[PDB]
Curated annotation (Swiss-Prot), chain A:
Protein name: Small ribosomal subunit protein eS8
Chain intervals with Basic residues compositional bias: 7-22
InterPro entries assigned to the protein according to its UniProt record, in alphabetical order: Ribosomal_eS8, Ribosomal_eS8_CS, Ribosomal_protein_eS8_euk, Ribosomal_Se8/biogenesis_NSA2
Predominant subcellular localization, coarse grouping: cytoplasm
Region annotated Disordered, chain positions: 1-22
Organism for this UniProt entry: Drosophila melanogaster
Oligomer and partners: Component of the small ribosomal subunit. Identified in a IGF2BP1-dependent mRNP granule complex containing untranslated mRNAs. Part of the small subunit (SSU) processome, composed of more than 70 proteins and the RNA chaperone small nucleolar RNA (snoRNA) U3.
Swiss-Prot record, chain B:
Family named by the database record: Belongs to the eukaryotic ribosomal protein eS4 family.
Residue span(s) of domain S4 RNA-binding: 42-104
Molecular function per GO: RNA binding; rRNA binding; structural constituent of ribosome
Pfam families, A to Z: 40S_S4_C, KOW, Ribosomal_S4e, RS4NT, S4
GO biological process: cytoplasmic translation; translation
Gene: RpS4
Keyword vocabulary terms for this entry: Ribonucleoprotein, Ribosomal protein, RNA-binding, rRNA-binding
InterPro entries: KOW, Rib_uL2_dom2, Ribosomal_eS4, Ribosomal_eS4_C, Ribosomal_eS4_central_region, Ribosomal_eS4_central_sf, Ribosomal_eS4_KOW, Ribosomal_eS4_N
GO CC, one annotated term: cytosolic small ribosomal subunit
Gene3D superfamilies linked: 2.30.30.30, 2.40.50.740, RNA-binding S4 domain
Protein's name in the database: Small ribosomal subunit protein eS4
Length: 207, 261
RNA sequence: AAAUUAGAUCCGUAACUUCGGGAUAAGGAUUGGCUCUGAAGAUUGAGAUAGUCGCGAUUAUCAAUUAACAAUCAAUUCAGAACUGGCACGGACUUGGGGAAUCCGACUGUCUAAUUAAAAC
RNA sequence: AUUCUGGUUGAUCCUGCCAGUAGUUAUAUGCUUGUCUCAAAGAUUAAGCCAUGCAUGUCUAAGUACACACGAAUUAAAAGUGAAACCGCAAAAGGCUCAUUAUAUCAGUUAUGGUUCCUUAGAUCGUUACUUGGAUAACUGUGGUAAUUCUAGAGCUAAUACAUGCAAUUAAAACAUGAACCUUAUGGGACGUGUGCUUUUAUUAGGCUAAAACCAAGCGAUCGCAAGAUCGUUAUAUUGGUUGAACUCUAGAUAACAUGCAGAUCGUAUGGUCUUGUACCGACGACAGAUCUUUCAAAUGUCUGCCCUAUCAACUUUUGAUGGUAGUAUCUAGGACUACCAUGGUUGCAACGGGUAACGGGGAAUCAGGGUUCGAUUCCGGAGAGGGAGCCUGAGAAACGGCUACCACAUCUAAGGAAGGCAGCAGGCGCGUAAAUUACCCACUCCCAGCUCGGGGAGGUAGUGACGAAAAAUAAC
RNA sequence: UCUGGUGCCAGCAGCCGCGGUAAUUCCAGCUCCAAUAGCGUAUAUUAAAGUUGUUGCGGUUAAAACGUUCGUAGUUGAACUUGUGCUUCAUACGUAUGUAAGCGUAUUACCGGCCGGUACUAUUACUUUGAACAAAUUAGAGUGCUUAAAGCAGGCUUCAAAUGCCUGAAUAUUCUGUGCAUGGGAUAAUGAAAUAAGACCUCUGUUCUGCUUUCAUUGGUUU
RNA sequence: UCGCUACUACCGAUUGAAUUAUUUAGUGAGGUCUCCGGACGUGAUCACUGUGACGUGUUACGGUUGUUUCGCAAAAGUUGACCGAACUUGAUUAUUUAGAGGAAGUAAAAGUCGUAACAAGGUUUCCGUAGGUGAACCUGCGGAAGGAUCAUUA
């Protein structure tokens, strides 16, 4: 099969090592995943001793985690924008580790004003001319049960300018942090502070 | 794993710390992977036919151990080749034997018939205190008996006496510069007590200096060092007389030359 | 006589040798269309901090830029990838068959306008 | 048991080689041989081919038993022996050989905190019928082709095989979320909800020297009439951890995650309790369980150490060479593989190339020492099964006494097709200077299985045997 | 220095050499000598070999100093540093310190009862003793397999009855070197202080870094 | 030197011949993986049909039914990658071998021709270098004594 250790592959002087141990199983390699953005496939491969890992060709959904929260909301995966290993992997939309990715931005925002009821980032006020009627069904204060906890915050609720602009579009930049050919999933964190400003300078200034 | 794992083992390749003869067969007892390692074992074809001479063939040992007459550490152990290493109390209540495997000063082991009252507990050293087994704490023993919920002052490099009916600690003997010890594994095998000083080499292989009752100061690795009590404290019964660090000619002068016959 | 080869890119290339060569030696691979991707330039850079007078017009600057500084603008060439059909792709045209020797003249040059271009001069 | 003699001259002293000399587990061969104890033995040439035969199978009272094949008696308990067949395990060890291989194997040292692991022992197992579904061998029955090997069609039936499935999975407790609670504070609640492990991602703590000057709640406590003002006690930077350490590590909590896994099993006894009524519980073992710790190991990497050759001086890098970087892939590190940058890396202290009649090491032969030569060969390690490549199942194999193809050789054929690898043990051809029986048994040493009992040309044991070692007929008075 | 045969023939002989009608060497008879269930021959290999030379050769003439000198790699490199003296006492016989203690201004600071925890170690080669690691082999301890090479057993009370005893089954070269621990500090290299980025000091607070203890809890003012 | 009889090793047209491994290109069996695929064999709904039951409005049991909804897997075959045997071609090595002719060497003294050297070898020898000659050799230039001078000549 594909082999993974140096039976071939000449030495540090430049010299050809000759033959070396006909071909052994324990140094095998496998054909890759190339997990596209097709919805829902997993093949599982029987690995070294007794085990199994999940070769997840064609995934579509991922357990993404806003790292500055301690939250991890599952979304779907929309676009594969940037990748440092290649551009053959961007263009064919293949998911491997840290591809910069675009997810949903919605299951975080509903989680955001659940615990951090402060409305931001706010959309166009022509839509916001009336509520149904949210600001009392948010907290209502009870005089006084569990819920004054929503106002010794507002120290947390000033998420940065370059992230709240990316929430109003309803799609946010994230980053894969799993091994989709191995772990069977494409999870990850999202770009917030300076991982953001690097990977976004990489896009709009290059074009 | 590379087409392993080597179920056979040859005579003149099993150690001569079990005193096997070069003729007598091509093969060797090959202990079946118990608590103790292979080179630190005495498989129960050795202890029954070669030593106690209860048998005379190899077939006359499975006609002993399968009837549950043998009893290693309180449990039965009908394995015909169970490893049964250091201080494993083979408590034969029939026919009332009560051994313990303690190692001789000549690098070898010695048959030591012990008292039946102190047979039912044995002394064993600790290796790694760690979390994770129930609930948080546990330590691993030199034979590997993991025992849960220990004393928080038993660190590594110490020994605890384990009762053979329970699996519970009753006394700990910790590693200070006043405690007599015992060596198992090197050239200094069988020599008993007492500690002087330990040279800590950071990363790795600490050695320690041991002074015998003859004033015979010597040294060995900290891996080989068991511990069997404080100063002039035999907490277990020892075999023949302590492993004095006999001279080479004195054993040829004690009983070989000075011989009544 | 005719056929074979032929453009270009890449790899590779023997005997001899006046060390210049031989040599485009020989021998092989690649080549269309379509969608992108990379690389190779130029020109102003871009200036952050009172308010008189009523931000507005008369209205500031050493340097640090910087590691894609940011837009404009400019030509064209070269590498890469994916898909894609009757393998038809240098699709017409333009366009070397090669090699092992022997003889003569070294070479380029010249000659019998109208039968000899040579080894002759 | 640190020694030398003959041979150059008409004779001499030398240099010098030749010839003698002795050992060789060192091969052949020549002649002869009365014992006897041990005993090497197709390595050299052909890792060149091979007739025949065998070398891997396995059952406990304890996975499944509808055989009259044999046991007994109207009890389903037959619990007997259990053939078969299923399932579980093993067939990856051993045994043979030395073609390949020149820092490669190997030896020592050290590592794996860069991994993985059947077994073995040890510890461990709550957050809607509880007792189940269908379908096959064995078995019956009828068949096919040159051909036994191969297999179809139908009728039956099992489980620790396959599949589903816990009403105590049971909450209080723990604890978010609301909730009938409602007070100038190191302050309080019924209940509705939710909280297996494992994987994945993410977060936060992470092993730790001492006090006040001053200050809002003035609660503990004090003073001012008080609005209150000045102060202040401890439980509060509360997890093993190498005792070399941001070990991403074994632990824990938080926010999720998807998707699986989760004890519908078996022999011997049963009485506590009889209403003999599924009200009442032992000791054992398991196709098995899961996590952690061990163990038999492996596989990589560290630092040194290898023969002949310069009539081999520069090599490597398009097509990975040296590094960076992100990935993929693997059990895991890593140019191992990809993409992008950097231009490195080895070298007269011999790189690179070539040769090898080279498997490496333990060791063997021979000397006073220093040494030279050898090691196919019983032990450890590597390597391979006609030549290469591929691969399935399996904890473990790039397995060949497994498969698949190509190549070379051969085989059967009724011409359609089917199977084969003795460098296992014997045996035959062949090549050769050069090497034995187509024998006997598992009592030994151990190995394997469901495992006191089966199997094991592993192993022991006779036959051949002047390879080699030892004690000693061939006379004595 | 036997007897017949042959006559540079047949042949023998590792080499030197024999044999040409007297052969101590051939071929045979008669004898003799070596080792002996053995011994001869062939090839290889070690010793012989001071003919491969580290121990340990040779180079004027026997084989052999480059025609000459430069010269890098390499190999080798002058001397120099706390050496001892006294005072001693422990110790072979007024003599002998061979263990040590006292002057060369301080061979590392505390507590313990001279003695332990204890803070601090220019370096490498060499060397001491160790650690650490397969067995067989080898060296070889012990032992009447009858002996022997082997073997790892066996022996005793004892001719016994008798879990009735006793002890075995060494220690080492090896697996030479690398690497580790420890003692030494002769020998041999490197190292340091130059108009001082020299040392202790002027311990000045000019500058520091930091963070766990207390600001009840918990926040601000800040030493 | 030459001539006869042998023996070894060279040079050499043939751009000879036979291997041996190692590869560039080319084709290419198989297999892993993958894109589809969906024999047969169920699930299962859609209706129901056989009957009874309720209020014929609805349902219970049978028809391996009718036949549409909805799955579940899954063989052949396939698309693309990747490992890659294998043959065909080219180059590169590393050995071995046939060759007209040519030319050195050795053994073989007993052949021919002459006498080169060693005696002051009758021209002292030797060396380096060039040319010449049937052959040993000769001659020039330079050197050396291994010479036939260790030299006596204020």
């Amino acid at each position: 099969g594909i082999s993974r250790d140096s039976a071939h592959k000449r030495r540090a002087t430049g010299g050809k090592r000759k033959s070396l141990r006909k071909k052994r199983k324990f140094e095998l390699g496998r054909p890759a995943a190339n997990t596209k953005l097709g919805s829902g496939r997993v093949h599982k491969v029987r690995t070294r001793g007794g085990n199994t890992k999940l070769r997840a060709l064609r995934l579509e959904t991922g357990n993404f985690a806003w790292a500055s929260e301690g939250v991890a909301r599952k979304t779907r995966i929309a676009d594969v924008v940037y990748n440092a290993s290649n551009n053959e992997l961007v263009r064919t939309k293949t998911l491997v580790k840290n591809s910069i990715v675009v997810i949903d931005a919605t299951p975080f925002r509903q989680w955001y004003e659940a615990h951090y009821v402060l409305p931001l980032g706010r959309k166009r006020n022509p839509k916001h001319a009336q509520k149904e009627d949210e600001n009392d069904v948010l907290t209502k204060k009870r005089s006084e049960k569990v819920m004054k906890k929503y106002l010794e915050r507002q120290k947390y609720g000033k998420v940065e300018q370059a992230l709240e602009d990316q929430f109003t579009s309803g799609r946010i930049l994230a980053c894969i942090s799993s091994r989709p050919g191995q772990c069977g999933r494409s999870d990850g964190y999202i770009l917030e502070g300076k991982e953001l400003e690097f990977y976004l300078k990489k896009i709009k200034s290059k074009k | 794993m590379a087409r392993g794992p080597k179920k056979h083992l040859k005579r003149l390749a099993a150690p001569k710390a079990w005193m096997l003869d070069k003729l007598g067969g091509v093969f060797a007892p090959r202990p079946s992977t118990g608590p103790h390692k292979l080179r630190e074992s005495l498989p129960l074809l050795i202890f029954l036919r070669n030593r106690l001479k209860y048998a005379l063939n190899g077939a006359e040992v499975t006609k002993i151990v399968m009837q549950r007459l043998v009893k290693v550490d309180g449990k039965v152990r009908t394995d015909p080749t169970y490893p049964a290493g250091y201080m494993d109390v083979i408590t034969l209540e029939k026919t009332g034997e009560f051994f313990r495997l303690v190692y001789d000063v000549k690098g070898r082991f010695v048959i030591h018939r012990i008292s039946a009252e102190e047979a039912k507990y044995k002394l064993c050293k600790v290796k790694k205190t760690q979390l994770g087994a129930k609930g948080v704490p546990f330590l691993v023993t030199h034979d590997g008996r993991t025992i849960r919920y220990p004393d928080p002052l038993i660190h590594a490099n110490d020994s605890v006496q384990v009762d053979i009916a329970s699996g519970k600690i009753t006394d700990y003997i910790k590693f200070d510069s006043g405690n007599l010890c015992m060596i198992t594994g090197g050239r200094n095998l069988g020599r008993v007590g007492t500690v002087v000083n330990r040279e800590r080499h950071p990363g790795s292989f600490d050695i320690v200096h041991i002074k015998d009752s003859q004033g015979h100061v010597f040294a060995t690795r900290l891996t080989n060092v068991f511990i069997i009590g404080k100063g002039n404290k035999p907490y277990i019964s020892l075999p023949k007389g302590k492993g004095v660090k006999l001279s080479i000619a004195e054993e040829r002068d004690k009983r070989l030359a000075a011989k009544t016959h």
